[PDB]
Design a protein around this ligand. Structure first.
Ligand SMILES: Nc1nc2c(ncn2[C@@H]2O[C@H](COP(=O)(O)OP(=O)(O)NP(=O)(O)O)[C@@H](O)[C@H]2O)c(=O)[nH]1
Ligand SMILES: [Mg+2]
Ligand SMILES: [Mg+2]
Lengths: 325, 157, 162, 162, 101, 72, 144, 29
C-alpha cells in the first residue's frame, strides 16, 4: 500500500554562441537510483513536492565552448522498485542497490540548427511500486481466518501483513497475509485489484477457505466452500491468467465445527468431481480453467490442529519447486 | 541632507493640538440610541401578544436537562395545550420594567422558561411538572394576578 | 469584605458567607461628572508605581488584576494601572499579595536584588555585551512609556532610557 | 442510552450493520430482530423504518418504531426507483401538493411531530424542501397528460444512466 | 457542569435546594441548582437524587447535601458565589470519596 | 403515468391496504396551495419583522463562519 | 460590465464601492492594460458586477491614484480575493481598498493637516527666505 | 556619522525666526 507518483522534467540545454558558433551544454538528465535503508514514504516526506528537475546546461562562453552538461538529478528509491509510466507501462525494475535508470532526458544545447537556443528537455510522470512479494501469499475471504492462521503459525504476531514460518534448520519461509482480498473485487477493481497486483509477485499461493461456507448478508447468496473456491478461481482468471501457473495449496479452516467433518467430506467429493456441479454456476462464474491443488488440508486455528503438517507440506512443495527449477 | 536643512525639517514638524480636557474623560453628551432592531422589536411584539392572549403563565428555571427529556415534557404539556417559550432576560427586563407585570422582573434571572396557556390548566401542568421534582416553580400569573407556587397549588386544588 | 467560614459539629459541616466591611466608593466625589474613577477623583497624571494605597484597590488578594469590565475603568488608565501593578510587584511593594504557593513547595535560596521601576520581567532580559557606538548606543529601559504624560514638576522630562 | 437506526421493515439482520453495535451494548441481536420482524409484519417489507432502542443497565432493550422515510414517500409517490444523480440541475420525480398533504397527514403522527405539536403547514414546507433535495419538483396543479411525458423522459434518463 | 460531571457522583445520595424567587439574591443558588441538575453530572449516578423546593416564607437560600456516608453539608447561597459553592461542593465530594474508598 | 396520477402508492404502507386515490383541488384546504414551491425567499424579499428573516441571517452567519474555518 | 479594450487627482470614489489603490508612482503600458483587462474579465461576472477604469489610454500614475474601480451588490471579501491578486500583479505597490477605510483615512489626514498648530511652516520659511535657508535649498523646492 | 538636533538648538532657531518675523513687520510701513 505505497504506490507512488512523481513528476520529472529534464533541464533545458545551454544557450549557444552565435558569432563564434559555440554549442551550449546539454540539459541535466533525470535518473532514479536504488539505495537501501529508505522507503517510499521516507522519500515522500523528505520531498513533499514530488517534483524533480535536473541542472541546466551551461551556456557557450568564449573561454570555453561546447559547454559542460548540467548537473543531473538522482532520485533515491528502495530496492525491489518497479518504475512505470503514467500509462502503467513498466519503465524498469530496480532489484539491487546502485541500479540506475534514466527516466527523463535533458534538452539539447544551443546548436546552429536550433538558432543557438537551448532546446527544452523532457516532461514525464513516473509511478513507483515498492512491492516485491514474499514466497507464500495467503488468499482468503473476509473472516476466513487468514489473520488467525497467521497468528497461530507465527510464534507471536498481531492478527489485526507479513510474517515468517520458522523451521528447525533455522530456515524462514516468508508468508504474506493479505487483508481485503474481497473488497467488492468483482465490482471494485480500483482497490481490491492492488491486492492482486501485490500477490502476483508470489511463488506459491495458499487459499484459506472456511468449512462453514460464507455469506455477506442474510439477503446475499449463501456460497459454500466449493463455491468460494470457484469464485476465487474465476477472480484469478479474470485478473491474470498467468497467476494460476503458480502452485496453489488449499486449507479448509474452522475444523472445530460439529459439521466440519461432513462438510469437508462433501467438499472433497466436489473436488473429486467438479464437472458434475459446474453447471450450477452461470457462464460468467465458470472459470476458463480449473486450478489443481497439490495438497488440501483441514486445519483449525483455535485448537492448533494440522499447522505443523501444513508448514511441512509448504516446505516440501517449495523444495520440490526448487529442485524442478 | 545638509545639517541646516535637517534642522529646518526638524523645526517645521507637525505638532498635534492638545485639548484642555480629554474627550474620553469629559462627560459624554447624550446621544440618540439605535433607530430600530429586527430581532428585539419582534421579541417585544411576541411577548406582548403572548401576555395579552394567554391567561395562565408559569415562569420557571430551565435546568440543563437532556433534550430528549425536555421534548418529552414539552409534548406532555402540549397534550394539555401548554406552550413553552423562552426569551432573553436582557430583552425581557426592558419590557417588564415598564408594564403591568413590573413586579415579575426579579423572577427573570438566568435561563428561564414560561409555560403559557389560554386555558388555565394549572392542575395538569403541576401534575406534569411533578415528574421531575428538581424543577422549581419559581412564579406564575393567572388573570393578571401575581402568584407563587403555593398559590398555584391552591388554585389547582 | 466577604468571608466564608466553616464549622464542623456532630460530623456535620456548615459553611456560611458573611460580610464584615463591604468596600464602596466614598460619597460626593470631587468631580462626579467624570467617566472613569480617575477622572472623577481628578487623579489623571497624578499617580506613580509606588502609590500602593491607590494601586491595591484594583488588585486581587493574590496579586492578580481585576477586569476592566468589573472596575469600570477606561482602556488607557487600565493599562497604566496594570503596568504600575507589575512594577510595584517587581519592586516588592505588595508583600501581602504573594502568589498562592501549592502545598509542599518551598522556594529555594535565591539572590535578593533590590530593584525598582523595572519595565520588563527579570527572567527575559539579555545582558548588553555590545553597547555600540555613541550615535547608535543601546539604552537601558527605565519606567514605562505609558507614564510619559504624567505631571513633572521639574524642567527635565522623565528619562525612560538610561 | 438511545440508539436510532434505519432498518428495513421485516428484514432485520443479525449481521451488519447493527450487529456489532448491539453486541457492544450486549443487547440481544436475535431477540431484537425477532421483535422487529413481529412488529413490522404488518408493515411492507424493504420499507426503511426508524428504530429507536433504549438501553437499560441490565441489558434490557425496548424497541420503538417511527414512521417511514419522507424520501421513500416521495420516491414511491412519484414512481422513481432511485433519486437523481444531481440536485437543481435535473428533476428526477414529480409530486403534487395534494400528495404532500396526504404524506404529511400520516407523518405528523410520528415521535418528532408529536413532540413538536406543529401545524401541518410547517410539515408540508419541510416535506417540500426535502423533495427539493431529492430533486422531486412539486407543482400546484398536475395532470397525466404531461406526467406521462415526464415519466417517459425520466425513464429514458435512467436507461442512459444504467 | 463539566468539572462536576468529571468528578461524577460517587458518595452523593441526596441534594435539596431551597431559595426565594421573589428575592434578588438567588441567582447564585439558581446557577448551582442548574449545575447540579445538569444531565452530564446526573447521568454519572442515577441513584443520587436532586430536588428543588420553593417557599415564600422569605427565608435564606440554602442547599443541603446528604451523602451515603451519613455526612451532611449545608451551603448558604445568600452571599456565596456559584463558583465558590461549586468548588466547596466538589472538594467535599472528593473528601467523601477518599474517606469511603 | 396513469397509475401515478390516479392513485398514490406511497401513502398506503400496508400490503392489505389499497393506494389512496387523489382528491380534487377544491376539497383540499387553501393553505396547502400557498407554499413556496420555488426557491426560498431571499433576505431582501423577507421582511425585517419576521422570524424567518432572523433565522436566515443566523444560517448565513453560520455558513460564513464555516467557510472561513474551512481554510483555517 | 467588462472593461473596454485598450489600444497601444482621480483619487476619490465616484461610482464604485471598492478600488485598487497604488502606494507608489509607476508607468503603465498597453501590455499591462490588456493583461489586467483580461484577468478582470476572466475573474468577473457580467450579470451582477461592473468594473471601471480611471487612467487614460496609452501612462504615468502617481501615488494614491485609483486605476481600477469595482461596483455592484457585493461585500469587501467577495472582491478582495481577486483585487489583491490584481494589485500584486500591478507593476507597483498596490492594494485592494475599501471606501469605508479610505475616506476615513483621507478625512483624518485633512483634519490633522488643518489642525496643525506649528507657528513656523516650511512653505513660510522658504518663501520668506528666513535664516537665509535658501542658500541650502533646491530652486524647485520653493514650490515643490 | 548621523547628526540630530537638540532642544536648545530648537529654541535658538525659533527665537531667530521670531526676530526675523518682527523685522518683516517693521519693514512694512
Ligand atoms: N471456532 C473457530 N473460530 C475461528 C477459527 N479461525 C478463526 N476463528 C475466529 O474467527 C475470527 C477470524 O477473524 P479474523 O482474524 O479477522 O480473520 P480474517 O480472515 O483475517 N478476517 P479479514 O480477511 O477481514 O481480515 C476470529 O473471531 C477468530 O477467533 C477456527 O478454526 N475455529
Ligand atoms: Mg484479518
Ligand atoms: Mg458564526
Amino acid at each position: 500500500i505505497d504506490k507512488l507518483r512523481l513528476f520529472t522534467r529534464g533541464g533545458s540545454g545551454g544557450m549557444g554562441y552565435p558569432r563564434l558558433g559555440g554549442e551550449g551544454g546539454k540539459g541535466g538528465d533525470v535518473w532514479v537510483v536504488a539505495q537501501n535503508r529508505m522507503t517510499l514514504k521516507q522519500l515522500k516526506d523528505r520531498y513533499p513536492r514530488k517534483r524533480f528537475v535536473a541542472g541546466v546546461g551551461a551556456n557557450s562562453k568564449i573561454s570555453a565552448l561546447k559547454g559542460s552538461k548540467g548537473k543531473d538529478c538522482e532520485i533515491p528509491v528502495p530496492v525491489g522498485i518497479s518504475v512505470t509510466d503514467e500509462n502503467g507501462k513498466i519503465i524498469g525494475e530496480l532489484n539491487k542497490e546502485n541500479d540506475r535508470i534514466l527516466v527523463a532526458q535533458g534538452g539539447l544545447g544551443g546548436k546552429l540548427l536550433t538558432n543557438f537556443l537551448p532546446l527544452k528537455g523532457q516532461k514525464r510522470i513516473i509511478h513507483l511500486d515498492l512491492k516485491l512479494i514474499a514466497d507464500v501469499g495467503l488468499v482468503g475471504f473476509p473472516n476466513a481466518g487468514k489473520s488467525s492462521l497467521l497468528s497461530c503459525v507465527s510464534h507471536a504476531k498481531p492478527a489485526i501483513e507479513l510474517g515468517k514460518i520458522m523451521y528447525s534448520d533455522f530456515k524462514q519461509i516468508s508468508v504474506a497475509d493479505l487483508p481485503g482480498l474481497i473488497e467488492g473485487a468483482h465490482m471494485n477493481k480500483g482497490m481490491g485489484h492492488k491486492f492482486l497486483k501485490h500477490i502476483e509477485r508470489t511463488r506459491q499461493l495458499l487459499f484459506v477457505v472456511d468449512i462453514s461456507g460464507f455469506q455477506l448478508s442474510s439477503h446475499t447468496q449463501y456460497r459454500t466452500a466449493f463455491e468460494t473456491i470457484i469464485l476465487l478461481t474465476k477472480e484469478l482468471e479474470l485478473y491474470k491468467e498467468e497467476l494460476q501457473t503458480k502452485p496453489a495449496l488449499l486449507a479448509v479452516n474452522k475444523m472445530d465445527l460439529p459439521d466440519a467433518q461432513d462438510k469437508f467430506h462433501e467438499l472433497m467429493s466436489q473436488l473429486q468431481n467438479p464437472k458434475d456441479f459446474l453447471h450450477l454456476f452461470e457462464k460468467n462464474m465458470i472459470p476458463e480453467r480449473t486450478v489443481e491443488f497439490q495438497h488440501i488440508i483441514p486445519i483449525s486455528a483455535v485448537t492448533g490442529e494440522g499447522i505443523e503438517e501444513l508448514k511441512n507440506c509448504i516446505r516440501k512443495s517449495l523444495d520440490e519447486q526448487a529442485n524442478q527449477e | 541632507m545638509h545639517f541646516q536643512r535637517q534642522k529646518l525639517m526638524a523645526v517645521t514638524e507637525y505638532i498635534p493640538p492638545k485639548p484642555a480636557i480629554h474627550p474620553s474623560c469629559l462627560p459624554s453628551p447624550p446621544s440618540p440610541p439605535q433607530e430600530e432592531i429586527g430581532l428585539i422589536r419582534l421579541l417585544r411584539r411576541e411577548i406582548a401578544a403572548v401576555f395579552q392572549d394567554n391567561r395562565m403563565i408559569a415562569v420557571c428555571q430551565n435546568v440543563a436537562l437532556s433534550a430528549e427529556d425536555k421534548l418529552l415534557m414539552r409534548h406532555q404539556l402540549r397534550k394539555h395545550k401548554i406552550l413553552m417559550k423562552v426569551f432573553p432576560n436582557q430583552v425581557l427586563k426592558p419590557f417588564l420594567e415598564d408594564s403591568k407585570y413590573q413586579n415579575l422582573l426579579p423572577l427573570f434571572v438566568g435561563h428561564n422558561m414560561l409555560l403559557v396557556s389560554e386555558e388555565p390548566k394549572v392542575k395538569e401542568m403541576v401534575r406534569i411538572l411533578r415528574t421531575v421534582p428538581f424543577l422549581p416553580l419559581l412564579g406564575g400569573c393567572i388573570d393578571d394576578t401575581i402568584l407563587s407556587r403555593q398559590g398555584f397549588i391552591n388554585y389547582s386544588k | 469584605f466577604r468571608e466564608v467560614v466553616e464549622t464542623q459539629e456532630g460530623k456535620t459541616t456548615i459553611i456560611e458567607g458573611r460580610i464584615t466591611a463591604t468596600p464602596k466608593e466614598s460619597p460626593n466625589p470631587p468631580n462626579p461628572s467624570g467617566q472613569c474613577p480617575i477622572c472623577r477623583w481628578n487623579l489623571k497624571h497624578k499617580y506613580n508605581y509606588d502609590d500602593v494605597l491607590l494601586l491595591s484597590q484594583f488588585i486581587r488578594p493574590h496579586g492578580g488584576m481585576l477586569p476592566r469590565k468589573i472596575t469600570g475603568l477606561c482602556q488607557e488608565e487600565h493599562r497604566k494601572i496594570e503596568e504600575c501593578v507589575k512594577m510595584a510587584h517587581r519592586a516588592g511593594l505588595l508583600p501581602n499579595h504573594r502568589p498562592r504557593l501549592p502545598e509542599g513547595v518551598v522556594p529555594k535560596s535565591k539572590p535578593q536584588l533590590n530593584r525598582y521601576l523595572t519595565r520588563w520581567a527579570p527572567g527575559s532580559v539579555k545582558p548588553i555585551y555590545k553597547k555600540g557606538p555613541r550615535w547608535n548606543r543601546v539604552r537601558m529601559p527605565v519606567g514605562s512609556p505609558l507614564l510619559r504624560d504624567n505631571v513633572c514638576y521639574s524642567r527635565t522630562p522623565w528619562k525612560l532610557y538610561h | 442510552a438511545m440508539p436510532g437506526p434505519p432498518l428495513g421493515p421485516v428484514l432485520g439482520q443479525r449481521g451488519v450493520s447493527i450487529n456489532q453495535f448491539c453486541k457492544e451494548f450486549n443487547e440481544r441481536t436475535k431477540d431484537i430482530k425477532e421483535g422487529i420482524p413481529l412488529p413490522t409484519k404488518i408493515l411492507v417489507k424493504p420499507d426503511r423504518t426508524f428504530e429507536i432502542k433504549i438501553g437499560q443497565p441490565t441489558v434490557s432493550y425496548f424497541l420503538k418504531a417511527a414512521a417511514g422515510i419522507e424520501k421513500g414517500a416521495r420516491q414511491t409517490g412519484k414512481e422513481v426507483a432511485g433519486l437523481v444523480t444531481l440536485k437543481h440541475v435535473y428533476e428526477i420525480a414529480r409530486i403534487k401538493a395534494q400528495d404532500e398533504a396526504f404524506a404529511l397527514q400520516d407523518v405528523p403522527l410520528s415521535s418528532v411531530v408529536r413532540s413538536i405539536i406543529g401545524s401541518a403547514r410547517s410539515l408540508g414546507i419541510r416535506v417540500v424542501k426535502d423533495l427539493s433535495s431529492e430533486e422531486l419538483a412539486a407543482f400546484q396543479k398536475e395532470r397525466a397528460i404531461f406526467l406521462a411525458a415526464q415519466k417517459e423522459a425520466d425513464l429514458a434518463a435512467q436507461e442512459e444512466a444504467a | 457542569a463539566a468539572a462536576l460531571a468529571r468528578l461524577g457522583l460517587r458518595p452523593v445520595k441526596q441534594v435539596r435546594v431551597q431559595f426565594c424567587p421573589f428575592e434578588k439574591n438567588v441567582e447564585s443558588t439558581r446557577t448551582f441548582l442548574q449545575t447540579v441538575s445538569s444531565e452530564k453530572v446526573r447521568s454519572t449516578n442515577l441513584n443520587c437524587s436532586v430536588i428543588a423546593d420553593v417557599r415564600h416564607d422569605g427565608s435564606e437560600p440554602c442547599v443541603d447535601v446528604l451523602f451515603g456516608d451519613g455526612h451532611r453539608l449545608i451551603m448558604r447561597g445568600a452571599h456565596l458565589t456559584a463558583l465558590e459553592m461549586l468548588t466547596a461542593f466538589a472538594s467535599h465530594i472528593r473528601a467523601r470519596d477518599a474517606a469511603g474508598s | 403515468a396513469t397509475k401515478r396520477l390516479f392513485g398514490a402508492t406511497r401513502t398506503w404502507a400496508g400490503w392489505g391496504a389499497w393506494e389512496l386515490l387523489n382528491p380534487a383541488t377544491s376539497g383540499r384546504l387553501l393553505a396547502r396551495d400557498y407554499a413556496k414551491k420555488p426557491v426560498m425567499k431571499g433576505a431582501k424579499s423577507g421582511k425585517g419583522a419576521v422570524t424567518s428573516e432572523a433565522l436566515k441571517d443566523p444560517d448565513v452567519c453560520t455558513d460564513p463562519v464555516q467557510l472561513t474555518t474551512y481554510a483555517m | 460590465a467588462l472593461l473596454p479594450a485598450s489600444a497601444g487627482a482621480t483619487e476619490f470614489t465616484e461610482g464604485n464601492f471598492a478600488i485598487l489603490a497604488l502606494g507608489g508612482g509607476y508607468l503603465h503600458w498597453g501590455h499591462f492594460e490588456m493583461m489586467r483587462l483580461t484577468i478582470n474579465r476572466s475573474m468577473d461576472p457580467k450579470n451582477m458586477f461592473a468594473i471601471w477604469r480611471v487612467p487614460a489610454p496609452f501612462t504615468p500614475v502617481k501615488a494614491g491614484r485609483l486605476v481600477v474601480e469595482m461596483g455592484g451588490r457585493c461585500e469587501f471579501e467577495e472582491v478582495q480575493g481577486f483585487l489583491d491578486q490584481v494589485a500584486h500583479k500591478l507593476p507597483f505597490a498596490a492594494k485592494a481598498v475599501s471606501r469605508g477605510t479610505l475616506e476615513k483615512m483621507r478625512k483624518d489626514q485633512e483634519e490633522r493637516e488643518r489642525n496643525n498648530q506649528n507657528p513656523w511652516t516650511f512653505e513660510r520659511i522658504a518663501t520668506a527666505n528666513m535664516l537665509g535657508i535658501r542658500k541650502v535649498l533646491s530652486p524647485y523646492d520653493l514650490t515643490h | 556619522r548621523p547628526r540630530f538636533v537638540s532642544l536648545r538648538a530648537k529654541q535658538n532657531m525659533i527665537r531667530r525666526l521670531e526676530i526675523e518675523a518682527e523685522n518683516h513687520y517693521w519693514l512694512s510701513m
